[PDB]
């Protein structure tokens, strides 16, 4: 893993020492080599977990997230190298530095073997996405969005630190495997209830849970494309990864304490899909779709079933890829028409044929077309939830219906229909953004072909 | 101000706290504090403006009252035990007199009402000398008597210090008052960790000093007196916005900055001594401190406030004000967190 | 009024360079940065990386556990032993409390 971390570290001197006419090319090519290098973590020929060192390790859950971060980093560069053309060279290199630092810190975060180092890297990733959103955002509300995001995450994460220090004093080392082996059953007392709530609330905030999800839509609306990618495809999955890591020491009182969060997740995905039906902003609609999918992930992780964990892992990866792709399409339309309005651009099926094909395939991934890993995660989550309780099928079915509704509503009102002929400034297509589209969609096809790579710890 | 008086006043400023740390006697620690007060009054009234006169008068009366409560405690101990040391059996009333006097020496809440007033109306260099140098000798006396202090009143003073400091830092716009309320919050942190281990108290003191000195220096470069003044720093000196952001984030205690380390290890030993409610309240008020820091960063670095015409000749002229010590202290206040076991004794 | 520059208008980039690829303004950097993301993204990653993970043997012991299961089914069915015992652990090695 350390052979993954170091060349990503040396990407930063390459960025700051490259020529201004070669920085984008050099960093994009070498980050593609980083993704190729990080692909070696799938060499898992035995059941034992790849403990590389005393502070770095790989798992069947941690490996796809590392590969995903290393894969989106060149995609972040490719999408961000168009709205930074009218920009200073030093600021361009600084933005590339922020993206590379986010990738490095997330790789260490997923490969962490220690929860306190996981927390240190948690805020280490919290910082530069704030910098990206606040400095390179477009509208006035980027400062308010950054404040909302930062302080939701911090007010979540401080009780996590409190509970981590207490459990470290209790057991001795707070190492994941030592906890997993010498796990002790809690006495189901009130102090243990508050400990559970404290150590769960950070990840529940940053997922986000329903009711506390208000930072996410404004963050994705005011964020640039690379910030939208990093949040919607890595950081929500980081919260889920944190819950999967920490839930092993919380038996047995999570059995009854999971009750309000399962209800919040189910009703939250219902109401956020309703918002997606009634929403006038494309970025907001994709953001609320992300809230609904992460609500499914919360429900699976809370019910703690092997099918639930596997479906949560596959939905993590599938939703990260398809949410980045949808945000990329929305951002391409945004640099076309300089407006984020859902209904303003309508007849893009004519002018952009192949981009409309990418739109159709992205929305088909969004509404969980078979046999894609989106459907695999969503369906196995339904399986585990119906095993948990039979009446979850009603809420799940309403959510699935409204999911198909908002995906086809997106396609119909953005591509199909009569063309807005007043829009003169419709550039045909960039090979850059089309390459970005194909590099988003092809890994979805490959993971559909081989879903055994992203099953996770359980199965 | 001639070199003779400059040397005398600066040497007395240095000599006071060094006498206080090096000396065994309560009498000699008191006279070292006395030296520091008399030495630093004229530099507060150096500029001879009415605001400087107000600041010097408030500072003098507060420090004199604190010195005499210290002296009362010393004489009462010497009556009770016949010695010049709070040894082991000195009275808790005497110790509470010492603690109240040393807290009002320091400027932590509810004795904090003078510190923004005094640090306002004085030049930035003397605000720096105050808010860094003047708070070591009371910490020397407090560290000298760590096991004997009353943890209840210590923790109450600390938590109200952090609450009032966070609220004042949120409200104020003037940079000197912002620094004063940041000081009050940090002294709350040190005072809370004081009875359990003075080593982390000294670690937090050093981290606060090495964060506060270069931020004050960046204030000295343009005499940026207000949020607007530090906001047009992008046109004044654009090469320091990154370090301004990093220093204020380290003052906020975000990981992976090394300013997170004192708060983190203080909270760690607070849980080692089972005061979880105390530590949680302190940590959320530290988040509020980070809020007004983040708003300051939003004003000065991440956004670009409108600039005026004469900043063109500000760019025309050249400056050699940032000294050799600024960058070293900034780097040690920004990227020192992997050296945490070496920083912690 | 305060002396602010007017709003910059985004020009047609295809007007000056009809072979624009999205990557940079001048044609020389435009075509080479295009060639980098295809040769390093599609060619050496989406093909070689796909081939590398396609030929990983015994991924999480899936092929081994099939061969071992066929061995154990062979071992138990020819000797009259049950396919699966109800207790994973031998009860003689477990000492239950007296009451």
């Amino acid at each position: 893993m350390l052979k993954i971390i170091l060349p990503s570290l040396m990407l930063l001197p390459l960025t700051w020492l490259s020529s201004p006419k070669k920085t984008w090319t050099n960093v994009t090519s070498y980050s593609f080599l980083i993704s190729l290098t990080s692909l070696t973590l799938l060499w898992q020929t035995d059941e034992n977990y790849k403990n590389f060192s005393n502070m770095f390790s790989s798992d069947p859950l941690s490996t796809p997230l590392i590969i995903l971060t290393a894969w989106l980093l060149p995609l972040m560069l490719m999408a961000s190298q168009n709205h930074l053309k009218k920009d200073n060279n030093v600021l361009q290199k600084l933005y590339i530095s922020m993206l590379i630092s986010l990738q490095i810190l997330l790789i260490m975060t997923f490969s962490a073997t220690e929860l306190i180092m996981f927390y240190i890297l948690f805020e280490a990733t919290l910082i530069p996405t704030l910098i990206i959103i606040t400095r390179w955002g477009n509208q006035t509300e980027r400062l308010n969005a950054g404040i909302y995001f930062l302080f939701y995450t911090l007010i979540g994460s401080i009780p996590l630190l409190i509970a981590l220090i207490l459990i470290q004093n209790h057991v001795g080392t707070l190492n994941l495997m030592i906890l997993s082996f010498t796990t002790h059953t809690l006495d189901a007392s009130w102090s243990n209830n508050l400990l559970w709530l404290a150590c769960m609330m950070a990840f529940l905030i940053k997922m986000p849970l329903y009711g506390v999800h208000l930072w996410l839509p404004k963050a994705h609306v005011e964020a640039p494309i690379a910030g939208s990618m990093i949040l919607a495809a890595i950081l929500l999955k980081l919260g889920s990864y944190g819950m999967i890591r920490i839930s092993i020491i919380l038996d047995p009182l999570t059995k009854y304490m999971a009750y309000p969060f399962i209800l919040l997740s189910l009703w939250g995905m219902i109401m956020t899909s309703s918002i997606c039906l009634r929403q006038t902003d494309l970025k907001s609609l994709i953001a609320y779709s992300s809230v609904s999918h992460m609500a499914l992930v919360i429900a699976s992780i809370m019910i703690q079933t092997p099918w639930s964990f596997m479906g949560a892992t596959m939905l993590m990866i599938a939703h990260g890829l398809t949410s980045s792709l949808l945000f990329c399409l929305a951002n391409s339309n945004y640099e076309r028409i300089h407006s984020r309005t859902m209904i303003m651009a309508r007849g893009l099926q004519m002018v952009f044929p192949l981009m409309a094909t990418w739109w159709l395939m992205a929305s088909l991934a969004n509404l969980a077309l078979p046999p894609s890993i989106n459907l695999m995660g969503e369906l196995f989550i339904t399986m585990s939830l119906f095993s948990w309780s039979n009446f979850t099928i009603i809420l799940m079915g309403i959510n699935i219906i409204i999911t198909g509704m908002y995906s086809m509503y997106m396609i119909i009102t953005t591509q199909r229909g009569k063309l807005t002929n007043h829009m003169i400034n419709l550039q045909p297509s960039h090979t850059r953004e089309l390459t970005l589209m194909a590099l988003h969609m092809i890994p979805l096809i490959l993971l559909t072909t081989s879903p055994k790579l992203i099953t996770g710890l359980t199965m | 101000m001639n070199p003779i008086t400059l040397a005398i006043i600066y040497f007395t400023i240095f000599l006071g706290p060094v006498i206080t740390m090096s000396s065994t006697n309560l009498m000699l620690m008191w006279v070292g504090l006395e030296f520091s007060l008399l030495a630093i009054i004229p530099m507060l009234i150096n500029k001879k403006n009415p605001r400087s006169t107000e600041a010097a008068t408030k500072y003098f009366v507060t420090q004199a009252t604190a010195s005499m409560i210290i002296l009362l405690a010393i004489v009462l101990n010497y009556k009770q035990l016949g010695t010049w040391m709070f040894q082991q059996q000195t009275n808790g009333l005497i110790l509470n007199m010492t603690l109240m006097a040393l807290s009002m020496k320091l400027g932590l809440a509810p004795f904090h009402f003078w510190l923004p007033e005094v640090t306002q109306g004085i030049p930035l260099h003397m605000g720096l000398i105050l808010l860094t140098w003047q708070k070591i000798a009371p910490l020397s006396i407090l560290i000298q008597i760590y096991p004997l202090l009353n943890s209840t009143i210590i923790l109450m003073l600390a938590i109200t210090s952090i609450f009032m400091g966070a609220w004042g830092g949120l409200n104020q716009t003037q940079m000197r008052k912002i620094m004063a309320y940041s000081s009050i919050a940090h002294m709350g942190w040190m005072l809370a960790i004081l009875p359990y281990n003075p080593s982390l108290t000294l670690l937090n003191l050093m981290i606060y000093i090495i964060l506060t000195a270069p931020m004050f220096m960046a204030l000295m470069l343009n005499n940026s007196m207000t949020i607007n003044s530090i906001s047009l720093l992008w046109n004044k000196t654009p090469a320091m916005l990154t370090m301004i952001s990093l220093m204020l984030l380290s003052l906020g205690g975000l990981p992976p900055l090394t300013g997170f380390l004192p708060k983190w290890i203080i909270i760690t030993e607070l849980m080692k001594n089972n005061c979880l409610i105390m530590a949680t309240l302190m940590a959320m008020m530290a988040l509020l401190n980070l809020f007004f820091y983040t708003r300051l960063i939003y004003s000065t670095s991440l956004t670009m406030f409108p600039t005026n015409n004469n900043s063109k000749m500000m760019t025309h002229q050249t400056k050699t004000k940032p000294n050799l010590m600024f960058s070293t202290l900034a780097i040690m206040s920004t990227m020192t967190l992997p050296l945490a076991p070496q920083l912690i004794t | 009024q305060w002396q602010e520059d007017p709003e910059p208008e985004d020009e047609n980039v295809y007007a000056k360079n009809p072979d624009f690829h999205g990557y940079d303004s001048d044609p020389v950097v435009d075509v080479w940065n295009m060639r980098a993301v295809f040769f390093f993204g599609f060619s050496i990653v989406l093909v070689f990386g796909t081939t590398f993970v396609a030929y990983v043997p015994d991924y999480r012991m899936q092929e081994w556990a099939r061969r071992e299961a066929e061995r154990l089914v062979k071992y138990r069915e020819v000797n009259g032993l049950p396919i699966m015992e109800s207790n994973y652990f031998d009860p003689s090695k477990i000492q239950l409390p007296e009451d």
Partner: peptide, 19 residues
């Protein structure tokens, strides 16, 4: 199309010594 940056009113909301 240009990024929004603070204007006179956003710059003047920080002056007044009380906020």
């Amino acid at each position: 199309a240009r990024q929004w940056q603070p204007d006179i009113e956003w710059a003047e909301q920080f002056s007044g010594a009380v906020m």
